[PDB]
Amino acid sequence: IVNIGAVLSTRKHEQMFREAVNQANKRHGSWKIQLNATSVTHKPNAIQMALSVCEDLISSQVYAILVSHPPTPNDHFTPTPVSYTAGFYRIPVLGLTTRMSIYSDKSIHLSFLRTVPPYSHQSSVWFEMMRVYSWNHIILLVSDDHEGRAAQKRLETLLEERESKAEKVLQFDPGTKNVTALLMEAKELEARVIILSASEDDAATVYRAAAMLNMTGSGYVWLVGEREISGNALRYAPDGILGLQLINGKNESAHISDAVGVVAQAVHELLEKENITDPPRGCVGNTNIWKTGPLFKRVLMSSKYADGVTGRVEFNEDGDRKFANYSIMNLQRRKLVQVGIYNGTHVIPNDRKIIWPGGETEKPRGYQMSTRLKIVTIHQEPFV
């Protein structure tokens, strides 16, 4: 027999997980392979959470672990204690609603999988959308943390394949309430795009600074990320921002079903192999990983199952996801209205309308050229 434990948020989610695992057991042949699941709730103290999760799940000799973000607002502490504790061995952990760039460095987290697009796909879809409007004068603002640095690196390498340069890049530092030099420097240029990847609160101050510089209106389009038009950042914001978001974001039951289906497929694929051991139990008396640890992860990367709730749930080399779906939304006098769909190099605009941040209707071309030069010469005898 085998067991697949998990860490969920509420008891209703636990009941949904039980129903899903029962349905999965009802599927397939279920010959000599039974998977009864166990669940556990969250805790405020991270130390208590880590100790409890190891002593509970490790002692049960699990074969996989599922972790989901707790219902508490903001923050990202959801996977870190479980990932660190279960990272001692090579038991894979599946993410459910944790989209952060810190969990992409395989050197730090050597065993972590999820099915949610990270924040790099925002840069990828920005490039894909820009390729169809033909402006190619991107100037972007990046927060000086690990979150914005990944986006900067992702945007830098993608444009090199097309042999293009993206104006200038600025750095405004996190946890500050006064930025004026960056906006003033960006005022004089030939690039009418304000591509921005902020982090919640900083969006408010940058929007106030931009509004005080009278740059929103009759040109100067804006592009932002999913987290830059949510909550308090939405209150102080100008219209016309292409506030791209993600489809089926705050949905987990479908993701739970997809995860359990792919886990069952991977387990069935792995069962037909050579001798297989079991992960140790006790959290105390064992200091060695089992032999075929990374083998399960490797066979889990190459597991494709495009029949659960959505399209092809394909894991790439990084392990985040492949072939995701977005929904380009545009602010228009509040009450965001869907404007287009994205499915991968096939951006399909809808036919509702477009309102650029000036009240106009034509697409604003991003170039002025200033019709002014600053010639510099060196004194010479017969020339100057």
């Epitope: 308090n232 100008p238 009450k335 509702r352 309308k353 009240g359």
Partner: antibody, heavy 117, light 109 residues
């Protein structure tokens, strides 16, 4: 700017109301917005939709398939077509457009119209 | 979508301070702005408070607005009550989907 709303005068049950709110001193084509306000007798107030001369409009999610509002820049008029209106739809319709600004705030308010289905 | 709760009616002595509260049950009324309209009996409504910190041109300075930010309610204060102020007061707010109006209250001298 001033607003004057005139209705068809027909308040028969199971019909469609279509009024027009003319604007004096203002231009229909602009960067602003125009919206309709409904007030039932002896109750609160609710918003039924907003118009824009440049295209898309957002009426409401409650009656998304029963209300259609159109504009005509030639006559400086905007009118609504509320189909399949029940006999209990007796209320007063007012036309206050918007303020550009950064948030929605109705200023000024039209004199409104009286309808008793 | 949500609803706004307002008391049916209030009464106070003239020349005193009267505080009216509009409460938003769902979410939290702390980010999006609110506005305070006044409608005379049989007349078109007139805006009285916008942005909860500024007043329209020619509006009396007695009216003031404040945000509790703790009980999730907006307060409007009127000083120096007069018989000409007898009208209905409505709280209007906007959300990421639609807009809503308060129940409304009427004061009596």
């Amino acid at each position: 700017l001033q607003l004057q709303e005139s209705g068809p005068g027909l308040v028969k049950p199971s019909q469609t109301l279509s009024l027009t709110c003319t604007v004096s001193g203002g231009s229909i084509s602009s960067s602003n917005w125009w919206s309709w306000v409904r007030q039932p007798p002896g109750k609160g107030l609710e918003w039924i939709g907003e118009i824009y001369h440049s295209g898309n409009t957002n009426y409401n999610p409650s009656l998304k398939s029963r209300v259609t509002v159109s504009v005509d820049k030639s006559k400086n008029q905007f009118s609504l077509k509320l189909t399949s209106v029940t006999a209990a739809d007796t209320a007063v319709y007012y036309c206050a457009r918007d303020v550009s600004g950064g948030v929605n705030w109705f200023d000024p308010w039209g004199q409104g119209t009286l309808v008793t289905v | 979508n949500f609803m706004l709760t307002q008391p049916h009616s209030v009464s106070e002595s003239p020349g005193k301070t009267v505080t009216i509260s509009c409460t938003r049950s769902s979410g939290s009324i702390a980010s999006n702005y609110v506005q305070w309209y006044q409608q005379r009996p049989g007349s078109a409504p007139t805006t009285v408070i916008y942005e909860d910190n500024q007043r329209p041109s020619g509006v009396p300075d007695r009216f003031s607005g404040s945000i509790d930010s703790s009980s999730n309610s907006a307060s409007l204060t009127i000083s120096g009550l007069k018989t000409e102020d007898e009208a209905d007061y409505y709280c209007q707010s906007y959300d990421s989907s639609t807009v809503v109006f308060g129940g409304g209250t009427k004061l009596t001298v």
